[PDB]
Amino acid sequence: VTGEEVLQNACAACHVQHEDGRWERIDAARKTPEGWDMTVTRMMRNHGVALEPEERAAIVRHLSDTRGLSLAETEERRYILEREPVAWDEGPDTSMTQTCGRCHSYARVALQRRTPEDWKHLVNFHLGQFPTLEYQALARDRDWWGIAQAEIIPFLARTYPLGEAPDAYADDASGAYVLAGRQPGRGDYTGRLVLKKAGEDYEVTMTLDFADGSRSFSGTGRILGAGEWRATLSDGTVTIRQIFALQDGRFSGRWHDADSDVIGGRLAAVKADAAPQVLAVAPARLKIGEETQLRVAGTGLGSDLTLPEGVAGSVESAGNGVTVLKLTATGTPGPVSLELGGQKVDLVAYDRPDRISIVPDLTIARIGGNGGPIPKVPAQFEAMGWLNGPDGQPGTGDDIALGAFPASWATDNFDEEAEKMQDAKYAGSIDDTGLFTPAEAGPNPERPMQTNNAGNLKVIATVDAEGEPLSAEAHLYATVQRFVDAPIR
Amino acid sequence: RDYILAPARPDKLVVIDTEKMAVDKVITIADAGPTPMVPMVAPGGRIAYATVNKSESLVKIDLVTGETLGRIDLSTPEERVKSLFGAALSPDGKTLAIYESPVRLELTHFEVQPTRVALYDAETLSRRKAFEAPRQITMLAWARDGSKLYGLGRDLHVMDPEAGTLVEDKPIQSWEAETYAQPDVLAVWNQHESSGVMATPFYTARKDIDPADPTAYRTGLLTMDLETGEMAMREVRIMDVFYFSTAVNPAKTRAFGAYNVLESFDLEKNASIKRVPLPHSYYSVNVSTDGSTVWLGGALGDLAAYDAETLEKKGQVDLPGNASMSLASVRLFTRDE
Amino acid sequence: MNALVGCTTSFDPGWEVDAFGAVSNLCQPMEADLYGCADPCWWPAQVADTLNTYPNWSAGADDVMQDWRKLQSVFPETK
Numbered sequence: 064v065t066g067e068e069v070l071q072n073a074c075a076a077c078h079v080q081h082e083d084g085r086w087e088r089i090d091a092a093r094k095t096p097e098g099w100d101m102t103v104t105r106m107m108r109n110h111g112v113a114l115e116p117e118e119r120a121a122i123v124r125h126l127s128d129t130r131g132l133s134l135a136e137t138e139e140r141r142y143i144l145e146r147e148p149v150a151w152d153e154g155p156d157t158s159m160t161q162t163c164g165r166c167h168s169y170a171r172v173a174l175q176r177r178t179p180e181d182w183k184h185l186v187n188f189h190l191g192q193f194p195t196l197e198y199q200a201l202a203r204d205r206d207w208w209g210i211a212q213a214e215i216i217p218f219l220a221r222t223y224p225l226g227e228a229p230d231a232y233a234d235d236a237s238g239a240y241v242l243a244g245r246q247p248g249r250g251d252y253t254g255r256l257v258l259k260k261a262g263e264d265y266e267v268t269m270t271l272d273f274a275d276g277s278r279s280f281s282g283t284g285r286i287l288g289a290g291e292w293r294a295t296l297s298d299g300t301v302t303i304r305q306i307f308a309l310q311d312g313r314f315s316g317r318w319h320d321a322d323s324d325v326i327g328g329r330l331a332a333v334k335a336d337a338a339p340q341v342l343a344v345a346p347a348r349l350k351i352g353e354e355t356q357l358r359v360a361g362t363g364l365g366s367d368l369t370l371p372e373g374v375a376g377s378v379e380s381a382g383n384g385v386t387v388l389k390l391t392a393t394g395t396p397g398p399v400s401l402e403l404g405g406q407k408v409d410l411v412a413y414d415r416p417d418r419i420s421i422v423p424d425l426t427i428a429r430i431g432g433n434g435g436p437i438p439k440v441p442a443q444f445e446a447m448g449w450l451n452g453p454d455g456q457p458g459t460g461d462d463i464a465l466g467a468f469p470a471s472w473a474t475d476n477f478d479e480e481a482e483k484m485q486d487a488k489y490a491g492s493i494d495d496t497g498l499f500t501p502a503e504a505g506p507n508p509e510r511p512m513q514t515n516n517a518g519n520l521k522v523i524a525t526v527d528a529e530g531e532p533l534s535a536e537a538h539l540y541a542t543v544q545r546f547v548d549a550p551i552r
Numbered sequence: 553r554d555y556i557l558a559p560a561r562p563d564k565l566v567v568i569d570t571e572k573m574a575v576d577k578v579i580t581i582a583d584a585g586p587t588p589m590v591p592m593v594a595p596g597g598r599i600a601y602a603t604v605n606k607s608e609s610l611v612k613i614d615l616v617t618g619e620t621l622g623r624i625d626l627s628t629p630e631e632r633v634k635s636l637f638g639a640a641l642s643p644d645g646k647t648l649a650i651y652e653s654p655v656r657l658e659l660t661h662f663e664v665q666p667t668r669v670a671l672y673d674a675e676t677l678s679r680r681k682a683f684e685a686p687r688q689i690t691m692l693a694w695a696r697d698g699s700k701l702y703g704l705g706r707d708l709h710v711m712d713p714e715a716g717t718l719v720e721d722k723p724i725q726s727w728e729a730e731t732y733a734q735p736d737v738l739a740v741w742n743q744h745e746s747s748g749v750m751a752t753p754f755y756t757a758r759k760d761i762d763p764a765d766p767t768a769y770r771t772g773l774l775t776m777d778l779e780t781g782e783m784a785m786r787e788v789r790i791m792d793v794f795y796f797s798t799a800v801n802p803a804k805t806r807a808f809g810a811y812n813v814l815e816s817f818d819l820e821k822n823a824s825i826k827r828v829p830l831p832h833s834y835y836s837v838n839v840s841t842d843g844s845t846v847w848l849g850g851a852l853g854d855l856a857a858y859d860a861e862t863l864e865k866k867g868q869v870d871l872p873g874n875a876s877m878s879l880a881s882v883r884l885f886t887r888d889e
Numbered sequence: 890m891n892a893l894v895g896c897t898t899s900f901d902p903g904w905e906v907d908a909f910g911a912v913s914n915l916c917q918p919m920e921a922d923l924y925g926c927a928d929p930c931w932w933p934a935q936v937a938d939t940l941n942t943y944p945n946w947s948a949g950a951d952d953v954m955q956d957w958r959k960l961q962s963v964f965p966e967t968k
């Protein structure tokens with residue numbers, strides 16, 4: 064099934080094709096693959112447009128290939144496409160944030176390009192589909208409709224003009240790649256990614272090598288538009304999704320568990336045969352006076368090592384995308400650099416962190432299961448270490464990062480009111496890897512008013528670095544389920 | 553003799569005999585899902601009207617017989633119309649005032665239309681007039697003398713149903729602006745029948761007090777007397793909790809607010825009288841004809857009775873199958889012995 | 890609520906978090922405020938709006954306290 068086919072056999076029943084060739088609405092806007100998907104879903108859902116599985120995938124794909132955005136146009140907003148759990152979303156100003164990012168992310172707006180006329184239709188679509196919109200908080204406090212027409216629509220048209228769709232990705236991405244990345248809660252990894260063209264798609268196998276073992280997933284993937292890589296891979300009963308950006312033969316992005324997007328990893332991948340290039344080094348810090356193993360992931364790094372003053376050590380192995388080093392710094396705490404295969408590698412020497420911060424420091428978890436069709440939504444935390452940097456500091460935009468440190472995790476009531484309710488007792492528990500698992504959904508007759516197993520919690524992490532006074536907290540809202548969700552929140 | 557008309561999803565209207573604390577009759581309506589919204593009882597307690605079908609329709613029904621005597625479909629092929637929370641029967645039971653938030657449905661786009669108030673002749677259910685009304689109006693309520701139609705929007709809108717115009721705007725949005733922050737009003741519950749007073753709590757803050765200081769936030773009471781045509785806005789307590797709706801007693805000496813707690817207010821002192829907790833969240837509040845019983849509803853499927861004086865729970869009437877009342881309006885009506 | 894990507898900032902009193910920055914002012918229990926949020930589509934990005942988009946979403950679950958397990962997510966499970 065082709066896009067042209069669905070466009071003529073399904074879309075044309077309501078959408079007019081002008082003598083100009085352009086389609087009504089269809090050609091007045093550009094958005095991401097996820098964006099076009101949500102639009103097609105609404106056509107099927109709201110306007111009874113019958114679409115077979117292949118037709119649906121076909122037009123969605125066709126729209127992403129012809130009317131998508133450039134990778135540069137998604138900059139700053141990829142967090143919403145990747146389901147990145149540690150994110151911050153807002154509009155360009157208070158007005159826009161309040162009127163457009165109060166239901167869904169403002170990122171859903173910023174990832175679209177339209178003509179002034181179409182932005183008008185879109186705002187008319189909102190008040191027409193959700194008429195109570197103008198009665199809700201942040202809307203009933205003002206002349207919503209009046210301001211939508213005078214200020215909001217002209218802002219959208221002015222700020223996100225149609226422009227022109229980029230050229231589709233034309234090239235063969237098949238081949239072996241070397242990768243490196245991290246999975247919060249588990250750690251760093253290296254690995255391989257191989258693609259085998261199959262029609263317009265690619266067969267894909269991604270192998271992840273953690274210090275405690277490796278695992279491979281296999282499935283299908285494809286490139287949409289200028290460079291949006293999307294793939295679904297499996298291994299046993301586990302399924303993951305890749306949401307990458309492909310540019311200059313290099314993949315960059317996030318993959319996640321298909322049954323829980325909060326769980327996943329970030330990575331970068333380049334052709335296995337590429338010229339000398341460093342992808343990452345793990346760990347990226349050195350505990351002064353102590354010899355440590357370091358894994359420098361990349362291509363053609365070989366074993367030519369030129370170490371700086373304060374660090375001594377050697378190369379233990381090389382090849383297959385990773386060069387293992389064995390160093391030891393003896394200088395003073397601070398940023399250190401070396402060369403390998405002529406490529407720069409940055410590290411940080413230290414003896415003890417000046418402080419640790421919890422990432423995310425503000426987040427949510429959602430109750431689930433308990434016989435219901437909606438599974439729990441966990442929250443992954445990690446304790447990051449730091450150095451006050453050059454300014455004295457204790458916490459300003461200056462600082463030097465040390466990376467994630469192993470820690471002891473605990474939850475507690477956020478405040479007095481929460482204690483009275485015994486939130487920490489019912490909201491769930493956090494394990495030693497900093498993974499918070501929420502409680503069962505549904506009313507709990509054991510709590511007052513038989514309320515849900517929700518709670519206003521505090522997450523405290525304590526890393527055992529000597530020197531010793533080290534701890535940090537995070538704010539966790541163990542809240543209720545969401546019955547509406549979408550590719551782009 | 554007091555009775556309660558409570559909607560129950562997806563297509564019911566349950567009449568409760570408050571005296572025997574039991575269900576009196578269950579009226580089932582066709583094409584009514586997902587739930588009826590705004591029910592109205594005609595003088596005499598025999599005939600009722602209810603907005604149904606996603607607020608796009610309204611049916612006339614015989615409370616005793618249980619049959620549907622007629623229906624009004626506000627939507628047409630090219631125009632979807634929502635009544636939302638605005639629907640009111642005139643005191644003389646002759647004309648229905650229906651708010652209309654419409655959207656024109658074109659082949660591949662929507663065109664938001666100006667909001668309207670449509671008047672229907674009750675006996676025949678025929679559309680007799682339609683005029684443009686301000687937007688963002690939740691409830692419509694008739695003056696007791698049937699001369700004016702009030703609409704609760706960003707301001708209390710006074711409309712002349714005869715001329716079909718907006719004659720006066722009673723300030724809300726800018727109430728005591730030199731002293732308080734813009735009033736926040738979330739009112740969707742029609743429950744002024746017993747007192748003839750449409751009331752809703754509103755939230756604001758003292759402008760001359762640090763916004764970080766919790767004592768800056770105040771809870772106010774908005775009362776629109778449908779008999780005298782006077783609206784009053786005054787602070788009643790430092791805001792520590794939130795109430796979804798409020799009902800004034802027939803004597804107009806007290807107002808009761810509810811959500812997760814039930815609290816009574818002395819309207820003569822404009823101060824709190826007493827507060828008690830609740831077993832679960834409630835939305836609606838109504839007061840018996842004798843002013844002795846306060847009724848809480850909405851959210852779930854049980855009507856709870858409370859003594860107006862001690863706020864002690866007197867009893868509870870479960871709707872059939874515990875069918876939820878959601879945010880639909882709960883009304884109290886009478887029938888001569 | 891800017892850090893809480895995907896949650897609503899329309900606090901009436903809210904869905905993910907209260908207008909007070911806690912969860913004690915949300916409905917008690919949540920299923921008591923569920924249909925109040927759905928029927929008028931107050932938070933269409935988090936709860937199915939039966940007013941227009943998902944009219945039959947609560948079919949068969951008239952008794953929210955007992956039939957809540959019947960309410961499905963309108964997202965067939967995906968990213």
Ligand code: HEM
Pocket residue numbers: 069070073074075076077078088089102103105106109110111112122184185188658659660661662
């Ligand atoms: C064919 C599968 C098809 C496509 C593709 C399509 C796209 C599309 C877009 C991009 C819009 C604009 C939405 C926006 O404002 O962001 C849009 C809007 C409407 N469509 Fe459509 N549409 C397709 C098919 C159909 C068919 C077969 C019908 C008629 C049954 C139809 C109708 C509509 C309507 C009405 C709108 C405006 C309201 C809205 O939901 O936006 N479409 N369509």
Ligand code: HEM
Pocket residue numbers: 094098101102105162163164165166167171172175185186189193196215219931933934942
């Ligand atoms: C602010 C006025 C605002 C903007 C701008 C905006 C945009 C927007 C887009 C571009 C979409 C995607 C539509 C498509 O087919 O491409 C979208 C979708 C939804 N929105 Fe929105 N939105 C703005 C504001 C609001 C507000 C205040 C709400 C909540 C009342 C809201 C809700 C929604 C919902 C729900 C959708 C999904 C609809 C569907 O596909 O079923 N938006 N918005």
Ligand code: NA
Pocket residue numbers: 901902903916922925926
């Ligand atoms: Na609510």
